[PDB]
Structure formats: C-alpha cells, structure tokens
Amino acid sequence: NKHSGIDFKQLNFLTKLNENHSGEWWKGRWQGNDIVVKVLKVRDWSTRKSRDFNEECPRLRIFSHPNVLPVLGACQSPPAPHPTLITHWMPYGSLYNVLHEGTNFVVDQSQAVKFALDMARGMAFLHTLEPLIPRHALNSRSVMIDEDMTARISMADVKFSFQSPGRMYAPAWVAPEALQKKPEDTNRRSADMWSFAVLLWELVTREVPFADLSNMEIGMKVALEGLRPTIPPGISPHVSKLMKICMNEDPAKRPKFDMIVPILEKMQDK
Template sequence: MANKFDETPLDKATKRLANILKDRAVQLGQDLQKIPFKDRSWLGYKTRSRDALLSRHTGIDIDQLSLTTHIANTHSGEVWRGQWQKNDIVAKILSLRECTVRNSRDFQEEFPRLRIFNHPNILPVLACCNQPPNLVVISQFMPYGSLFNVLHGETGIVVDQNQALRFAIDIARGMEFLHTMEPAIPNLILTSKHVMIDEDLTARINMGDYKFSFHERGKLYAPAWMSPEALQRRPEDINLKAADMWSFAVLLWELETREVPHAELSPMETGMKIAMEGLRLSLPPGISSHMARLVKICSNEEPGKRPKFDMIIPILEKLKQK
C-alpha cells in the first residue's frame, strides 16, 4: 500500500531487500499491485487463514480433488463441491466442445490473474487443473452461495436495509479494487450470481466466474444486468468501467426491491428489449429517495456521466449511518 507520496515499502527499501521481498511475496501468492493512498478499501481487512494457506498452490493434479456433490450445471461448466488439502472447495469444470492446445495455453496464461488474495471483497481462484480435456477452476466454498441465492432463495438470511447496504458497500469496494488493476480484468460481468456471500455475510466478487477468452465467445447470459452499450457493441468498443457501474445500479435495484430484474422475460427478450427498445427497470413506490437517486446516477444513459466506485462508496456509507 502506497503512502501519500505514492511510495510503498518496496520503494523505500534497498534494491537487494526489495528484490527479496518481491520474490517472497510471489512465493506466497501475493498480488504486487500497488494500492493507492486514497484507496481505503483495505480498512477492516481480515486475515483469512484458508486463503493464505491455499494461495501457495497454482496448478494441481485433478486426482488431488475429492469431488463429492454436484451443485449445478451452468452455461460455463459443471459445478461441484468437494475437498482439497482438507479444505471445502468448489470446482468448476469448464464446458468445451474441444480442449485444444491453444485453449490449454490460454487457460494457463489467464488463470494467475484471478488469484487475488489481498482484498476481503474478492473471492480468489485458489488453483486450477490444466489437464486436457479437463480445465478446472477451484475456489473456496461459500456456505450461503451467491447473493442471488440469498436474495431470491431460501437461505433464511434476513436482508434488511442495513444488511443490503453492507452488501452494496462490499461489492463497491471489491469493484473499486478491480478497477485499479492494470491491465484490467475483462470478461467478468457483475451480477448477483457472481457475488458470493461468506459465512460472516461478507460479499465477495467471485473471480471463478471470469469468462476465459476462449470460452463461450460471443454469447451473453446475463443481459438483465448489462448496460445498453454492452449489449449493442463489442467489449473493446465500450468503457468497461462505466458498464460495470450500470451493472452495479441493477444490483442496487435488486437489493432494494428483492426482485429479479426483468424476471418476466427470457434472457434473449431482455437483451433485445434493453438494447433495441429502451427497456429499463422502474423504481417502485416506497424505495428511499436517496437510493432511487443513486440508482439513477449509476445508470445514466451516457456512460461518461456515470460515477466511479470511489465516488459512491462514501455515499453508501453515509446512507448506512442514517
């Protein structure tokens, strides 16, 4: 973490000591990304022994996994619960028509960037199995599942206004951190299905839901959370950070209403109507005026006029204090 002069301990150390510290950090799976002085998302950082222990591992043999319970079949792959190194894990076996040598190589190149162990609101990928035809992504098991499951399933968790704001703040802090990364991590659509809820009700953005560059190209599965421009144009032709802010506005709406966005439509109908017919979420009566205003600001039709996450975190924190 940098001081107000944008210096880190590595900058202040001698060259020899800095190199030793860097090598040690890499061995322990630490991210060397500099956290700017203004970034306060590290406050309340919790040391997670499970993550710390498993962060040393990268590629592993699939025989080391004990997969016991089939959780779901998704568009991206089969999801299993199991154990690895005596830890509860979730393994996603990617669905591929054919696992080529190039797929395996790209998987190996892209996977390390998903091992983000230095932020409490990011759920890192712990390890991978790169054994064609099997490409497997391994994450820590989250007892309550996704935010979507908590809001719309039967977990028994009461999500009152305060808890909804805590979830929103967690997600905003995680996204703020991801937006500081260079180069940016593409292909991660922000939806309530891609936010996991830990045992202490911390919301964590799931890096295991990253869409690999070779996987399901050109297919969209969560249009209800996507911005109009993301549905109309290619990713390289839009402001991805602004598109993420639109997705966050949909999450705020979801947290306020406890409803599934555009639940009455199929995904294809939803995407077409948002992109071509101007379909938008309506704010129901009873929603707080402050939250209604924030949703509107974050979903401004002009991407360049949407705020950044470091601008809305203080607003959410003020709302939580009221």
C-alpha cells in the same frame, strides 16, 4: 513451467451443486479445505486454448482484498480431464441464492446496504488493475456470500477467451451499450457501474430483474426498444438518486466506484 497448478487426483468430489452452459459445480475437499470445483465445459479443446487457460488463470488469484474471492487454484488440462477451477466454499452461496432462493429469514435492509458497500469496495479495487481483468461481468450470480455475510466478487465467474463469446446469459445486468458494442469500443468501467445499479435495484425490490422475460427478449428490448428497470416507489431520495445516476443513459455521467463507496459508507449501521 512457472506453475503446475492443482493436481486433479487430489480433489475429492462430494456433492454436485449445479450445472449450466458454462460447466458443473461440485462441493469438495482438497488439502484440508472445503472447496467448490468448477469443471468447465468447452467444445474443440486445443493446445492453444489450454495454453490460454493457463495464462489467463493467474490474474484470478487475487488474495489482497476482503471483497474479492480469488481462484484458489486451477487444474491444467491436460493432464486434468477438463480445465477446472477451485475456490473456497462460501457457505451462503451467491448473492442471487441469498436474495432470491432463501429458505429461512429474509435478509434485512441493513444487511443489503452492507452487501452494496462490500460489492462497491471490491469493484473499486478491481478497477485499479491495469489492464482490467478481461470479460468480468458483475451480476448477482457472480458475487458470493461468505460465512460472516461479507459479499465478495467471484473471480471464478470470469469468462475465458475460449468460452461462449457470442452467448450472453445474464443480459439484465448489462449496460445497453455493452449489448451492442464490442468491449474494445466501450468504457468497461462505466458499463460495470450500470451492472451495480441493477444490483441496487435487486436489493431494493428483492425481485429478479425482468424475471418474466427470456434472456434474448431482455437483450433485444434493452438494446433496441429502450426497456429499463422501473425505479421502485417508496424509497429514500438518496437511494433513488444513486440508482438513477449509476444507471445513467450516458456512460460518461455514471460515477466511479470510488465516488460511491463514501455514500454507501454513510448509509451503513455503525
């Protein structure tokens, strides 16, 4: 084999951070690094799925862009007890954590704009890849915030071929067409721009989108009943314009990330 991956025996598990439908996250140490260990949850593991994990992981190892957070390595299973991903520990956690679960100063609107620019840069980069990294969904849980407050798109949050294919757990950020059509039948780049518009919404409101609804309700109402985020009042014209065009009903009228980067760069403090 070309790579054997990380040796599971070398990982020191320190503290449990989280658990959900996808697996468990633990803070740890490995070869002098502070890491997060993601132990994936899978039913009916097989040789085929193991082979797939090992072929899918190397695409996640992106070390050339400051706004992309790579997978540092992965533990192949067998011989690890379960398929596992390792990433460097990002001290502020996810964008979601920072915006919605902060315990201290509230991040200011300058910092929010810098988050938006960072995310757009990272997405513009990921959109240059051929083919696109499959099953990558942008949302506030899948962006991490590093020590100097840089936002980085999290490659460990990409779903694998064997994970939960018909279960969507963050539909509020998903484009209406993507709630209804197979990925093969949608323009994935345009769908990703909707997700970015919802993240702009979240940065403006500092609220969780559709926080009062369950995930099923959200997807059904967005897909079939025209439910949309309400454009917030009292915002600048160019923020309003940008959110509206990024969230256009027609996927083909939404901009490319590399066409919004220069708008966001003007909006920054310098």
